[PDB]
Design an enzyme around this catalytic site. Sequence first.
Site, PDB file in Angstrom:
ATOM      1  N   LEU G  40       0.834  -1.190   0.000  1.00 40.00           N
ATOM      2  CA  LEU G  40       0.000   0.000   0.000  1.00 40.00           C
ATOM      3  C   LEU G  40       0.872   1.244   0.000  1.00 40.00           C
ATOM      4  O   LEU G  40       1.954   1.257   0.593  1.00 40.00           O
ATOM      5  CB  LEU G  40      -0.934   0.019   1.205  1.00 40.00           C
ATOM      6  N   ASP G  41       0.395   2.288  -0.671  1.00 40.66           N
ATOM      7  CA  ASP G  41       1.138   3.532  -0.755  1.00 40.66           C
ATOM      8  C   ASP G  41       1.008   4.310   0.552  1.00 40.66           C
ATOM      9  O   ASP G  41       0.327   3.898   1.494  1.00 40.66           O
ATOM     10  CB  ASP G  41       0.651   4.357  -1.941  1.00 40.66           C
ATOM     11  N   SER G  42       1.658   5.475   0.598  1.00 40.36           N
ATOM     12  CA  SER G  42       1.670   6.285   1.843  1.00 40.36           C
ATOM     13  C   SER G  42       0.330   6.982   2.029  1.00 40.36           C
ATOM     14  O   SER G  42       0.048   7.413   3.157  1.00 40.36           O
ATOM     15  CB  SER G  42       2.792   7.280   1.824  1.00 40.36           C
ATOM     16  N   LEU G  43      -0.447   7.101   0.959  1.00 41.26           N
ATOM     17  CA  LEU G  43      -1.769   7.696   1.081  1.00 41.26           C
ATOM     18  C   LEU G  43      -2.862   6.654   1.211  1.00 41.26           C
ATOM     19  O   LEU G  43      -3.891   6.925   1.836  1.00 41.26           O
ATOM     20  CB  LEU G  43      -2.056   8.598  -0.121  1.00 41.26           C
ATOM     21  N   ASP G  44      -2.659   5.466   0.640  1.00 42.39           N
ATOM     22  CA  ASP G  44      -3.638   4.397   0.791  1.00 42.39           C
ATOM     23  C   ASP G  44      -3.748   3.958   2.242  1.00 42.39           C
ATOM     24  O   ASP G  44      -4.837   3.611   2.711  1.00 42.39           O
ATOM     25  CB  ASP G  44      -3.270   3.218  -0.102  1.00 42.39           C
TER      26      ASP G  44
END
Lengths: 494, 73, 38, 670, 81, 72, 85, 64, 98
Positions: G40-44
Site C-alpha cells: 500500500l502507498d503512503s496515502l492508501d
Amino acid sequence: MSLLYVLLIIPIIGIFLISTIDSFYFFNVSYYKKIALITTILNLIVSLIIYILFDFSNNQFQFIQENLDLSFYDIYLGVDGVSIYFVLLTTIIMPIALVSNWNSITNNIKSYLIIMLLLETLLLAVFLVLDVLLFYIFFESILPPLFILIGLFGSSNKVRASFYIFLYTLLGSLFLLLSILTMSSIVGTTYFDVLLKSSFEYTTQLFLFFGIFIAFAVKTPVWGLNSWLLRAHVESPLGGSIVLAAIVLKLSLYGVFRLILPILPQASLNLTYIVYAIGAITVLYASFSTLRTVDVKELIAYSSVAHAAIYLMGVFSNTIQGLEGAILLGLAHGFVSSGLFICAGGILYDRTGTRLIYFFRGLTQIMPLFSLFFFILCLGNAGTPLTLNFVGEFMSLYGTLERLPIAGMLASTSIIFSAAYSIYMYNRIAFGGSVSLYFIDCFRDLTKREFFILFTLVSFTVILGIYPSFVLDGLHYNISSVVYGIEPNASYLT
Amino acid sequence: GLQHYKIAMDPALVRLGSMISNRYKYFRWTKRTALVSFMYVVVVPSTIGYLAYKTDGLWDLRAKRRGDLISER
Amino acid sequence: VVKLTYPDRVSYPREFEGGLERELGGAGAVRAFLCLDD
Amino acid sequence: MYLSIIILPLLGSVVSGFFGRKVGVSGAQLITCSSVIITTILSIIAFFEVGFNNIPVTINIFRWIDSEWFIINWGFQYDSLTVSMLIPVLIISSLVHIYSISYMSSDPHNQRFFSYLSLFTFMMIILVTANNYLLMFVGWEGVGVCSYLLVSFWFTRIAANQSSISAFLTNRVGDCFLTVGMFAILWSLGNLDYATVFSLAPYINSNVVIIIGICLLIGAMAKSSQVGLHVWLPMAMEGPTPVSALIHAATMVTAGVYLLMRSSPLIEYSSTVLLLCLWLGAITTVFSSLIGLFQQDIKKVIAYSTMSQLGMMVLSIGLSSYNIALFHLVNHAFYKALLFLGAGSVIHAVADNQDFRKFGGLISYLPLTYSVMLIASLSLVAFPFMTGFYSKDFILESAYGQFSFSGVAVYIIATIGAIFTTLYSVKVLYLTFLSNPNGPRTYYRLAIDNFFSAQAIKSYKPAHEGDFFLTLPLVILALFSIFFGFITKDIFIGLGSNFFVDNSLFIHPIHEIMIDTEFAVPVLFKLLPFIFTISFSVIALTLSELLSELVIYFKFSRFGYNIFGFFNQRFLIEFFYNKYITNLILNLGGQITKILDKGSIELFGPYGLERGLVKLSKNISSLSTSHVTTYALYILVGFILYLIYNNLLLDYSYLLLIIILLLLLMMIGE
Amino acid sequence: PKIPYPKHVWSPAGGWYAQPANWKQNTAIFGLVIFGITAMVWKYSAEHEVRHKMPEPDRFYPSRYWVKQIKDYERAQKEKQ
Amino acid sequence: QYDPPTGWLWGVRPGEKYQNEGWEGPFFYGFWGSLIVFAIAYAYKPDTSIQTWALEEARRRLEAEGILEDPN
Amino acid sequence: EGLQKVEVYERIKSLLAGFDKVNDPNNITETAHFANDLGLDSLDTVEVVMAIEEEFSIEIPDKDADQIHSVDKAIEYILRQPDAH
Amino acid sequence: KPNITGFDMREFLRHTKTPTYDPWERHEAWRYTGRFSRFNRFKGALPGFGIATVAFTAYCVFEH
Amino acid sequence: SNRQAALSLYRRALKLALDWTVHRNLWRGQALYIRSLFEKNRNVTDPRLQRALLKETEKLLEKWKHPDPYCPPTAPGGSKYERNLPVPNLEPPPPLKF
Ligand SMILES: *P(=O)(O)OCC(C)(C)[C@H](O)C(=O)NCCC(=O)NCCSC(=O)CCCCCCCCCCCCC
Ligand SMILES: CCCCCCCCCCCCO[C@@H]1O[C@H](CO)[C@@H](O[C@H]2O[C@H](CO)[C@@H](O)[C@H](O)[C@H]2O)[C@H](O)[C@H]1O
Ligand SMILES: CCCCCCCCCCCCO[C@@H]1O[C@H](CO)[C@@H](O[C@H]2O[C@H](CO)[C@@H](O)[C@H](O)[C@H]2O)[C@H](O)[C@H]1O
Ligand SMILES: CCCCCCCCCCCCO[C@@H]1O[C@H](CO)[C@@H](O[C@H]2O[C@H](CO)[C@@H](O)[C@H](O)[C@H]2O)[C@H](O)[C@H]1O
Ligand SMILES: CCCCCCCCCCCCO[C@@H]1O[C@H](CO)[C@@H](O[C@H]2O[C@H](CO)[C@@H](O)[C@H](O)[C@H]2O)[C@H](O)[C@H]1O
C-alpha cells in the site's frame, strides 16, 4: 436578680470553671471542652425561657430590674421585640461555633475556650443594654479578645489580618463616640427612654448622622472599606469566622434601630440617597469581584458584603416591610454564612490545608453528604425560595424600591449576581469534572460532628423560610415604633 | 494543626496564590490605574447618586388608579 | 412591503347594548363599542 | 384529594432521594412511578370536578409571609385553567417516569435520577395551583433548581456543567424582572393574590399596568425561551433524553406561557404589552425555525422546534385569544414529548450517536419508532385533522383574523416560519430513517447474513427497538397525537364556550376576534398553510433524495457557505453573549479585584498610610541624636516659635500650614 | 459493563448500583408510611376545601362522598316536604 | 445485577464502631433537647401578637357596617 | 464483555478485503503489514486508517495514526480503546 | 491567479458525483443494495396507508 | 516533519469533505479528487516550495471549515464524553481523624 443578668453570668461562670478544674486533678482538654459546651447550652436554655415569657405586643422594655441607685456608668438590661431575635441568634450560634471547631484548635485550648466564653457575654450585652454609651462600651469591648483570637489561632496572614480588624474597627468606632457624646451633652443621659423622647435640631441631626454612619459604613462593611473583613474572616479560626460574620456584622444592623431610626429621622430621610448610592455600588462591585476570587473562604467573606448592603438599604426604607426584611436577612445570613464558612474553613481546609479553588473538583463523587448540604447552603446564599434568605431579600428589596425606586432596581440585580457566584463556586468544587488529580489519597466524607452542625444550621434556614411568622410576629409592634411619617387622614386625630 | 491528607501541591499554583496575596505591595499610581480608579470610585457612584437625588419622591404607585398620575411632584 | 399592501378590516366593529358598562366594571372602567365614531 | 395531588409527588421524591439505600433501584422506581401515577389519576378526576362543573376549589393551609398589607398564604386555588395545565403536566410526567425505567437502566445512579423527576413534578404542581404570585414564584424557582439538577445529572462532563450554568443564570435574569414586577403589584395594590389583582385590575393606573406587564413578559422570555433570553434551552439538551422530554419541551418551557395566561385579567387592560407579546411570538417562530434546519444534532433540532411552538403561543397571547394558546400548550406537550421519546429511542439503538450524518436506513430496523415519529411530525406540521391542526392553524387564521397591520405581518412571518418547520421535519424523518445508511455497518449487520464463524453467539448489535417500558409511552402518546385535538376542540376553541367563565381566561369584548376568524378570513389564507406544507415536503424530499447535488452546490458557494454557517451558529447570539456580556462581567470583576481592592483602595488607605507613616517616623526619630548641645538648640527653637505665635497675633491657620509643611518635609527622605 | 467505583463511599441515595436484598420489605414499609401520611392530608382537604357552588344531585362528582362542606349541604337538602 | 449497598457512614469501617468524641452528649440532649422542649412549650404560649388583637377590633368595626355579618 | 480479538479481526479483514489497493485478499493475516505485505502507498494507508476509524466509531489522533502501519498494530490499538463499538 | 495547490472549487463540485471507478467501491456497496435499495427504503415510508386505504373504501361503499 | 504533516492534511481534507457532503456516495467522488491533488505533488523536494503548499492548504481548510464538524460520540468533543467518569482513586481513605 433579673433573668437578663443570668444570661451574662453563666458564660462568666464557665470561664471560672475552666480556669480552676486543673486545681482539682493535668486535666484533659476534653474536660475543658465539655465545660465550655455545657455552659453555652445553658445560656441557650435561658434564652428560650425568656422567649416563652416575652410579650410580642408591648411598648415597655421587659425583664428589667429596678436599679434605684444611679452612678456615672450603670448597666441597665431590657428586651424588646427588636432585640429578642438577635439574642436568640447569638445563643444558637455560640454552641455550634464551639462544636464546629472541636478538633481543629489543638494548642492553647483553654485560652481559646475562655475567649469565646468571654465573647458570648460581650455580644449578649450589646443587645441587652438600654443606654447608647453602654451600647458603645460593649460594641467595642469585643476588639481585644478578637485581636488575640486571630493572632493565636489564625492562619498564615494572621498578624496583618488582626491589625486590620482592630485598627479599622477602632478608627470607625471613634467617630460614633463623638456623635454619642454630643447627644449626651444636649440631653444629659443616653438611657433610651429619655433619648427617644428628645427631638434634635436638623443641623445637629445632620452632623450626628455624619459619625454614626461613618462608624456603621466601616462596620457593615461598605465596598471601599471592606479590606479588614477580607483579611479578618479568612485568617480567623473557624470558630472566630462563625462569630464575626453571624453575630458581629449584625451589631451595626441592630445599631440603626437604636442610634438612627428613632432619634435622627429627618437626617436619615434627607440623606437616604447617599446611603442608597453607596449600598447600590457595594451590591455591584462586591458581586463582580466575588466572581473572580480564588480563595474559597474569601469567596464566602465577599458574599457577606453583598448581603449586608441589601439589609442596609432595607433599614433606610422608612417602610415596615423593608425594616422587618432587614432583620430577617440578618438572621438568615447568620445561619447560611455560618454553614458556608463551616464548609470552606472547616471541611476543605481540614482535609487539604489549602483554600485555593484551583485544587478542588468533583468533590460530590467521594463526599456525597458534604455536597448535599453544600448545595443547600449555596442556594440560600443565592436567595432561593423555601429558605429564610429569600423572605428577607424580598422584603428588604421591596422597601428599597418603595423608598427610592431606581436604587432598589439596581439592588434587585443581586438576584442575578448572588446566583452567579453561588452556583459557580458550587459547580467548581462539588461538580466540574471528576475528583481532582491534586488529591493524592482519598478524603473521608462528613463526620457525625460535621454532619450534625451542618444539618442543624440548614434546618433553621429552611424551617424559618417556610414559616417566617415565628420571627415576624415578635417584631411587628416594635418595628412599628421606628417608622417616620404621617398619612393625611390617619393622623392628628381628635 | 491537624495533619491533612496528601495533596500534590502544584508549585505553579502555589506561587500563583502567593502572587495574588502579596500583589498590593506592587500597586503604583500610573495614568492607567488612576483612570480606572477615578471611574469606579468617583464617576459611577456620583452618577448613581445624582439620579437617586433627582428621582427621590418622584413617583408613588399605592392606590393610584386611572385618572390619577404616578408622579408625586 | 406588508405595510404598503395589507387588507382593511372587512366587518364593522361589533356593537353592544349599553356598552356593557355595568358588566365591565361601571363608568370607572373601560367598556365595549357603543354608537361611537369609526 | 386536592391537597393530596400536591403531596404525593413530594413524598416519592423524598423516599428516592434520602432513602434510596433502603428501597434500592427497584424500590425507588416503584415508589416514584406509582406516586405520580396515582397523582395523575386523581388529577383526571379533578378535571371533571372543577372544569366540567364550574366549581373552583379553594384551600388555605397557613400563612407564609405576614406583614402590613402583605398576607401571602400557603394556599391553593383549583380553577378551569389549573386543571387544564395539570393534565399535560401529569400525563407526561407519568409516562416519562415509566419510559425512564428502560432508558436509564444501565446508569449507576437511578435513585438520584428518579428523585429529581418527582421533585420536578411537585414543583410544577406548585406553579399552577397557587393562590398568589409569590407562591407561584416558589414553583418557578423550584422548577429552575430541578432543571439545573437534571441538566447537570452527569456532573463529570464539563459541557453539562456549562449548560446548567446557562439554564440557571439565564432564568435568574427573568426572575429579577418578575421580582420587580411583583414589587410593582404589592406597591400598587398592597397584596399579590390573584383574586385581589384581577378584581382591581380594570381601575389601576394604565401606566402601572404597563410596568407590571413588561416585567411579567420579560420574566416570561427566560422560561418560555423567547428570542431575547433563549440561549439556554438548546444547551439543556445535555441532560438525559427523558429530562428533555418533560422539563425542556413539555412543562417548564410552558410556565412562561402559563404566567401570561393566568395574568390575563390584568394584562388585558394594557394593549401595549399585547403588541410586545405578539411580535415577541412571531420573531421566535422564524428565529428558531431557521436555526433548526441547519442543525446536525437530532436533539438540537427538536429543541429548536419546541421554541418555535412556544413562540406560537406567545403570539396567540398577544393576539388576545388565550383559549387558543392554552389549546396549543396542551396539544404540543403530547407530540413534542413523542418526538423526544422517539428520538431518545433511536439514540439508544445507535450507540448514543446523536448526529444525522451517521444515521441511515433504520426504517426497517425501528418500524414502531419511525411510524410514531411520523405521527408526531404530522401534528407538528399541523397536517389536517391531527391534534396540532386545530391548535396551530387557528393561531394563524386568528392573526389574519385581527384585521390589523401587526396581525397580517405576524401571519406572513409565522407562515414563513411554518415553511422551515416542514423543512426540518423532513430532514429528521429522511436522514434518520429514509436515507442511505451513513453510519457503521455495526448498526446494520444482522445474523441472517453470516459475517462471522467462531463468534456467532454474540457481537451483532443491529439497532433493535427497546422493551415494554420504552414502547408503552410511545404508543399512548401516539393516540393522543391523533385524537386529543378533536376530542377537546369544543372545551377550548368553541364558539361561545363557557369552560373558562370563572375568569380564569378573561378576554375583553374589545379584543374578541373569534367571530371574524370564523367568517371574515378568506378560504385561501385559511387553507394556505396546508398547500405550503404539502408543496415544500415534496420539494425537500426530491432535493434530499432525487437531486442531492443542488444542496452541495449551495453550501460550496461562498454565499451559501455564509448562510449555512449563520443559521448553524444560531444567529451568532451565543458568540456575542460570551464575548461582550459574559466575558465583560469577568473582566469587570478582575479590574475591581486587581486595580481597586488590591490596588488603589490599599494604596490610598491602610498600606499607603503604613508605608507613609513609617517613613515619616524614621525621619523624626533621626532628629534625636542624644546630644545635649543639639537638644538645647531645639528648646530655644521651640521657645521662639511659641513667642512669635503669641505676640505677632498671627492667624492660627498660619500655624497649621507650618505643621503640615514640617510634617511633609519629614515625609521626604534624604 | 459496570463502572468501577469506591466501596467506602456512603450515600443516602445508594451510590452506584445499590439494591438491598431486603429492598421489597423496606419498599413495602415506605409505601405504608406514604399511604398513612397521604391519608392525613386527605382528611385535611375534606374538612378545609372551600367551594362557593355545590354540585348537581345527579351529576358525577366523586368529592360528594368525603368533603364536609358538600356533605353538610347534601344532607341539609335531603330534608323537605 | 445490582451491587450490594456499601459505604462507611461517619467513616467507621465495617469492623469497629463509632467512638464518641465528647460533644455528642450535650449536643443531643441539651442543644436539641432544649429545642423540642421549646417547641412543645411554644404551642401553649399565649398569642400576644398585634394582629390577633387588631383583627378582633377590625371585625367589630366592619360588623358595625354591612361589610362583615355580626352574630348578634 | 468487551471487544474480542476475533471480532476486531473479522471486521478489519473484511475492510481490507473490500479495498482494491491490496495486492491480494489471500495474504491478509493478523500480522499483515500495510507497506510491503499488502503493498500500500503512503496515502492508501491513510485511507485505510480512516476506514478503520469509521468501522469502530473512534478517533485516531495524528500521533497514534502514524503508529498504525500493520494489521496487528491496528488490532492491538482497537482493543486498547475501551470506546470502540 | 490559480493557487499553488491544484484545488479549484469549480472542479471540486464537478466531481461531486458517484465515481465510475473507486478503490473503495466494493467496501461501500452494501449501503445501496438489499434493505438499502431505493424501493426498500421507501417501501414502508407510509406504514398504515395500504391497510387503511382498502379499509376506508369498505366504509365508503355504504350506499348499497 | 513535512510528511506526517501532509498526511494529517490529507486525512483532514477528507473529513471536511464528508462533513459538508453528508451523503457518502457523493463524498466518494470528492475524495478521489482531493487524492489526485496530493498525488499530483508527490515529487516536490525543495523545502522552499514544500512548506508553501502546506501553508496554502491550511488556508483552504480554514476557508471551508465546517461550523459543526462531526465528532464520534465517545471522543473529546462528543456527546457521551466524560459521562460517567470513574473515580480516579478507589482506595479507601488513609486513617486520619477530623
Ligand atoms: P508517500 O510517502 O509516497 O507520499 C506522502 C507524501 C505526499 C507526504 C510525500 O511524502 C511527499 O511527497 N511529500 C511532499 C508534500 C508536498 O509538498 N506536496 C504533496 C501534496 S500537499 C497538499 O496539500 C496538496 C494539495 C491538496 C489540495 C486539496 C486539499 C484541500 C482541499 C480543501 C478542503 C476540502 C474541501 C472542502
Ligand atoms: C483586655 C486584654 C485582652 C483580653 C482578651 C482575652 C484573653 C483571654 C486569654 C485566656 C487566659 C489565658 O489562657 C492561658 O493560656 C496559657 C498558655 O500559656 C495556659 O497555661 C498553660 O497552657 C498549657 C496548658 O496545657 C501548658 O502547656 C502551658 O505550659 C501553661 O502555661 C493557661 O492555662 C490558660 O489559662
Ligand atoms: C415599579 C418600579 C418603578 C415605579 C416608578 C416608576 C414609575 C414611572 C412613571 C412614569 C409616568 C409618571 O407620570 C407620567 O409623567 C409624564 C411626564 O414624565 C406625564 O405624561 C404626560 O405627558 C404629556 C405632556 O408631555 C401629557 O400631556 C400627557 O397627558 C401625559 O402622557 C404624566 O404626568 C404621566 O403620564
Ligand atoms: C481607613 C484607612 C485604614 C483604617 C485603619 C486601618 C489600618 C490598618 C494598618 C495595618 C498595617 C499592617 O500592620 C502590620 O502588618 C505587618 C504585615 O505586613 C505585620 O508584620 C508581621 O507580619 C509579617 C508578614 O510577613 C511577619 O513577618 C511577622 O509576623 C510580622 O512582621 C506588623 O506586625 C503589623 O503591624
Ligand atoms: C474609598 C476610599 C476610602 C479612603 C478612606 C481614607 C483612606 C486614607 C486616606 C489617606 C491614605 C494614604 O494615601 C497614601 O499616602 C502616602 C503618603 O506617604 C502615599 O504612599 C506612597 O506615596 C508614593 C506614591 O504616590 C510612594 O512613592 C511612596 O512610597 C508611598 O509613601 C500615597 O501617595 C497615598 O496614596
